[PDB]
Design a protein around this ligand. Sequence first.
Ligand SMILES: CCCCC[C@H]1O[C@@H](O)C[C@@H]1SC[C@H](NC(=O)CC[C@H](N)C(=O)O)C(=O)NCC(=O)O
Ligand SMILES: N[C@@H](CCC(=O)N[C@@H](CS)C(=O)NCC(=O)O)C(=O)O
Lengths: 221, 221
Amino acid sequence: AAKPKLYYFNGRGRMESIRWLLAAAGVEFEEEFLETREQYEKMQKDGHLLFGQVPLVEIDGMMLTQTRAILSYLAAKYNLYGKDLKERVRIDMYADGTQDLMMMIAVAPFKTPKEKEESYDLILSRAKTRYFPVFEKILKDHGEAFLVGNQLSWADIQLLEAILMVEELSAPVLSDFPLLQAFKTRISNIPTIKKFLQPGSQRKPPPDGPYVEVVRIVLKF
Amino acid sequence: AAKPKLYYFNGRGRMESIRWLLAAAGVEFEEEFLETREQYEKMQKDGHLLFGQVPLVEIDGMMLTQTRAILSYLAAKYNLYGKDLKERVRIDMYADGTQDLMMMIAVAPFKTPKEKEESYDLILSRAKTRYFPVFEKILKDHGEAFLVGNQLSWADIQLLEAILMVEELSAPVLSDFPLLQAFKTRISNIPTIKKFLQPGSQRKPPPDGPYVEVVRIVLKF
Ligand SMILES: CCCCC[C@H]1O[C@@H](O)C[C@@H]1SC[C@H](NC(=O)CC[C@H](N)C(=O)O)C(=O)NCC(=O)O
Ligand SMILES: N[C@@H](CCC(=O)N[C@@H](CS)C(=O)NCC(=O)O)C(=O)O
């Protein structure tokens, strides 16, 4: 058997969504870490990071190096990638949207004070007036627990995380999205999802000052 | 019948990779263009666009809207995604770097002449060391026709488009790379590819003056 080890910084980043999916997959995973600019260089020159970039996930003997390349491998392996091509596309179409949303968030910290300020306000508007109303309707129109084949999917997860991450900025955000709140609590109380959500987990906190710089040092921003 | 009427701009942009995919596949297609913002608004008003963002590509009675997804769907349909999920992912990683490379290029015209030089130099220096040496090494190792396990795959098509995408800046670049020049030829020599590379094909021209100014209008950038 394999013991899923994942290298990346100590924070959200492109490794977060990977953690979630694994947790929900009901899988225990250990993990290394990245702190020094030289640490990068070692494993770099070690010959692992195909295009010389992380995240990286030692699993099945393979060394995955590209984000979405990784997620897709995972989700499919652990049957959360729909069944037929018709549905798998709905997942992806969804995942790309949330991803875009979460992405705007993970990046704003590096921006200048005026920059990150203006981008945050915007994140709310793009979530409230573009990404949330759409998901609310998907739920209302088909009235169901899940999002696609009436079964747990990586789109379900991806959405939850996205909702959580958005409330961390504005808590009363879901104020106008009923079907979602239900979705949130419904999914939150899922066994594997709850465990990962309890104070004891591998889950990481939001982007903090110390983390920003510890990043700009390992990669030389 | 099969009428992939994919809506987008008169330029390369995000669709360009999609076009290449349909091309090699051996699938003809139409493509209504994006001229006035009144189109964008009125179309987005009909709920053709999920999160309100093109590429838009109606196919199989459906109406897809998220790039990475669209490629993933097509590639899978037209049997160009490995033999199992391991090949699928391997391909996915490759397709990611190529898409990364093609991305700073595709956005370049938007910046400013000053940035352009640096960025373009960066692209070259990145492509020459970052990606090409990697691909070359691979082709040598498993020494065979295609990058994957002997069969046209999304990767190959992604690489070729990438190669030529850069040669339109540094014609002599592929010189230091033997296996890449060889791969380049045989792949251009694909029946369906050669026909897509013909002077009469739907293949779009690299970005330009009016193309850089249209988006800033239609999409009010
Ligand atoms: C001109 C083409 C390539 C470079 C610039 C474009 O690429 C995008 O990164 C930004 C721009 S314009 C194209 C832009 N697409 C996106 O921003 C979403 C990308 C997503 N992967 C998708 O499948 O649609 C748009 O459709 N409108 C933006 C807006 O209001 O949401
Ligand atoms: N988008 C690529 C990674 C791109 C990227 O910015 N990754 C950063 C983490 S923020 C990295 O790995 N460092 C850049 C480097 O290799 O110097 C992927 O999906 O694997």
